[model samples]
Target: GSHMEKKTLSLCPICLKRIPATILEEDGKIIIKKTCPEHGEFKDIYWGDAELYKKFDKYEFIGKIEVTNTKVKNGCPYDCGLCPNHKSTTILANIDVTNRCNLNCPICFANANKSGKVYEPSFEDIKRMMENLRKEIPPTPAIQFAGGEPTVRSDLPELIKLARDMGFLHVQLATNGIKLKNINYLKKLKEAGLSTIYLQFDGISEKPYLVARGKNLLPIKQKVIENCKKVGFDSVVLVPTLVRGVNDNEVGGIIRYAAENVDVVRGINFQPVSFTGRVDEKTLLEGRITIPDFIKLVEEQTDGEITEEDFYPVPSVAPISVLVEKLTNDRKPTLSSHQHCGTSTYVFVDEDGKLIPITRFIDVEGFLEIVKEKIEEIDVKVLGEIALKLPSLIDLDKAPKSVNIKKIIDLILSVLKSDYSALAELHYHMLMISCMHFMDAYNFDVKRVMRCCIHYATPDDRIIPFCTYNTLHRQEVEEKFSIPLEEWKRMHKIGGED
Candidate 1:
C-alpha cells in the first residue's frame, strides 16, 4: 500500500476552530478547501499577519466574529453584551450635544426629537468623561458626539473644544446637513480640532429617505457635501443605517456616491440595524438588516454587475464586521472578489437573512449546543442569582446622583486637597491594568508591552479582569460591601504570573 498520508489540522480564521483533517506545509502555512453537502463549499486560510488584522477590509459575516479563541466556545464576549470592553471602550460617554434637526429620519434610534429626551450631557459629565477617558483609554478612543442633530447644539464649537481640553484626540460629531449646510460652522469646528464628522448621508435617491431616514434628505445631503468642501473638513465618514426592505438595496448607490464624492466623503459606514432602545425583537426581525443581505441587495440593484463577493473583511472594526466594495474610476475592482468576498468570513447566513449553517466551523459549537439546550445546567444559576438580586441594586427613581463615578473622584479630590501621593502610587498600576484591559477588549496580543503590560513592572498583570472586578465592586460598594479582592486575584492568578 502507499504510505499513509499524515493529516493536518489548523484553526479556521472565520470560526477560529480546528479542522478535522488535511492542510499543512513546512512553515505551517496552509489553505483549506472543503465542500459540505449541507453547509455548501468553504475555503479557510490561516491569517498570521498582524497587518491582516489591522488593515480594515469591508466584509463581515451575519453574526459575531471571533475575537478570542481561548478554548472557550461561548459567543464573542465583546459583542455579546457581556464584556465590559464593548461597554466602556465603545463609549467613554454618550455625549448628546444637540436635539435640533434638519432631517426627521425614520430609523433614527436616538429618537432625537418627539421623544422629550433633551440633547445634553452636563459640562461636568462631559469633563468627567474626558478625564476618565484620559485615564482609561488614553491612547486612541473613538468618541462620537451625537444627538437629534449635533449641529443643533449652539455651543457645539465650545463642546468640541471642551472635549479636546478634556483630552479627546479623535472627536466625531454625528450630524445631518445643519452644521455642514453652514460652511462657517464646519470651519469653526475644524479649527476647534474636530477630527471627523459622522454625517447621516442616507442614500442616492429621495425614496430611500422616506423609508430609511423619514425625510427627503437628498438636498440636505448634497448641501452638506458642498458646505464640507467649502469649510475644508476633509475627512467625513457617511453613516447609513441599512434597514431590511428599506435601504438595503441602496448599497451600490451609496458606494457609487462615496466613489464619486470621495473628496467630501471618506467612506460609507453601512450600519446594519441593531435591536436596541425603542426597537423590539419583533420589529427588528421585521426590519433587521444583515451585511450579506445588503451586499446581495446591492448586487441585484446593480444588475449583478457587483456581487456580494466583491468586498473584503476589515479588521479591528466594532460590532460584527465591515466590508469594502471598491468601484474604481478605471472600472476595475482590485480586491479578490471570490476568496474574501462572497465567502463566510465569520458566521454563515442564508439567503433569507436567517442564521444558518450553525457552527460546523467552530469547535465550541458542540459545547454551545449542550449549554443552549439546558442553560440551567451552567449559566442559568449565575444569571438567576443576578436576576434575583438586581432589583435591590437598581433604584430607577434615584435621579442619577451626579454620575457617581465623577462625584466620587471630586469628593476624593476635595478631601485630599492635593495630596497626590495616594493617587500617584496607584497611577502606574492603574495605567498597566488599563492598557491590559484595553488590549483584551480591542483583541490585542496580551504579551505586547505597549499594550497590556504598559508599565513594564508587573508585566503579567491582567487588565480587563481587574477593571471588571473594579466595575462590579463599585456598583456593589455603594449599596453593600464584600467585593472580594482575594478571590479576584486568585481567580486571575491561577496560571499567569503577576
Candidate 2:
C-alpha cells in the first residue's frame, strides 16, 4: 500500500516562496542550503544530537495535562502527537476532502471562490490513511476533518463513522457551517458522531458576513447553529476569525453576540488574522491586526470594563488568551485589572456571562525566564554533579574497564533521577510554550500547524514523519477543553441565555 511520494518544500520567510533546498551534511551538522537565484543563498541548519525530542516533552514544556481529581493523568507526555501543551487541543488531519467552497470572503485563506488547487482525496486513499492512523496512533488518538468545506464531501458521514468504529477517540470538524443550513444533514452527521461543530461565526450581522464570508452568510451560520442544537449538539463553540477592518471592529459586538447565545454558543474564539495563506498584500495587509492589537481592541471596546490588566496569562495562549468582560460596566477601571490583564492573564466569562478576573499565581515572565535558563543550567549542573561523583563519566573510554555501555547509561540515568532540577526546568519550559501557543494561536493559523501529522519515535531517537496536522494534540486538547466532552459537561454546563 505504498502511496504517492511527498516532496520536501521549505519556504522563504520574507518573500514566502517555496524553496527547493539540498540537505548538506557537514562537520557535525546537517544544513539545508537553498540556491534561490532571486534571494541568494539561505541556510537552515540541523544540529545533530540536539535535545529536540527532550524539548518536545511537556514535562519540560507546556504539554502536560495536570491530572485533576483523579490520580492517573491523561495525555501523551512526549509531543509524540501534537500535544495541547504545544497549542490547541486538537490535531488537524490535513486531508481537505475538497477545497471547493461557495464563498468569496475577503479574508479567506483558501481562495475557494477562485479556481484554486482542488484536492479531493478519494475514498480508498482516505480509508487507507485512517487505517494506518488507527493502527499507528497511540491511545486516545484524535483527528480533525477540515477543508474548503468538509461537509461538502459526500462520503464524510461514512468516513467519520468508519474512523470512530476503528477506535479513534476524538473527531472535530472546522467548518463555515453553510451545510448546516440543511437541518437533515446536521442531524444525520450528529447521529454519525460529529463531535464538535467549529463554526465560522465571525460577527453578528450580514454586513461582516458579507464582507468577510462573502454575501449574506449570517442566516446560513445561524441555521448551522439551530441545526446542530436540533440534532442535540448542545455544546457548540463560536469561532470568529478576527480581522482589523473586516471584523476586528466588531470584537466586543461579536463577543456580546456569543454571550447572547451562550447556551448553544459557549465560547467565542477570537482569531486574529495572519499573513499566511493566499494574500493580496493590498486589501488585507493595510488593516492587519496582531494578537496584542486584538486584545487592546477588546479592552478598548469593553470601554475600560476590563482594561489590559485584568486578564490572567494561560500558557500556550499566544497571540490571545481569555479576556473577561464585566457584565456590569462599573464605568471605572482598577489597577488590579490593569496588573492582571497586562501580558499574562486568562480572561474568564462568569456564569452570568460577565468578564471575571483571574491573575496568575506566579510571575509568568519572571519565572519562565528562570525556567528556560534552568533548562540550559540543568545540563551544566548535572555535568558538575556527575564529575564530582565519578570523574570516569567525563572520560567514558578511560574508566570503568569492567562496565559496559549499559552500565554507564544506567549510572547516568540514576544520577539524573537524584536531581530534580532538570525536571523542574522542563515544567518551566512547558509553561513558556503554553503561553507561546496561546500567543501564537492568538491571531495566527493554528489550523495549519494544528493540522500536521503525528510521529513515530525512531530507532535513532528521532521522529518519523507520518500524516497531516504538524502536531497531534491540537485535536486532543480541543476534545479535552471543548465543552461537549463528557468529562467537562458538568463542570462547564451552559444554560439558556443567561
Tell me the number of clashing residue pairs for each predicted model: 12, 54
Candidate 2's displacement at residue 214, Å, is 2.1
The alpha-carbon deviation from the true structure for residue 143 of candidate 2, after best TM-score superposition, in angstroms, is: 1.7
**Looking at model 2, which ten-residue stretch has the lowest summed lDDT?**
332-341
lDDT of each residue in 1-498, candidate 1, tens digit only: 112112433223234332333322222323334433444445433222223222323322122211221232332221122122222222223344444355565555544345332324445555654454344432224466765576655667777888777655467777776556767766888888887777776678888676666567788878888887777666677777666666666766776565455555654566655432234444445664444445556557645544333333421121111111111111111111112211221222223322211122222223222323333332225333333343333333421222332332343233223233433322211100000011111111111111111110001111222222221211222123122434434543321123
lDDT of 1 at 275: 32
TM-score of each: 0.46, 0.52
Model 2, 81-200: lDDT tens per residue? 333332222122334455556555676654453542334455665666555444432222556666567776677888778768866655667788877789888878888886666677
Best by lDDT: 2
Best by TM-score: 2
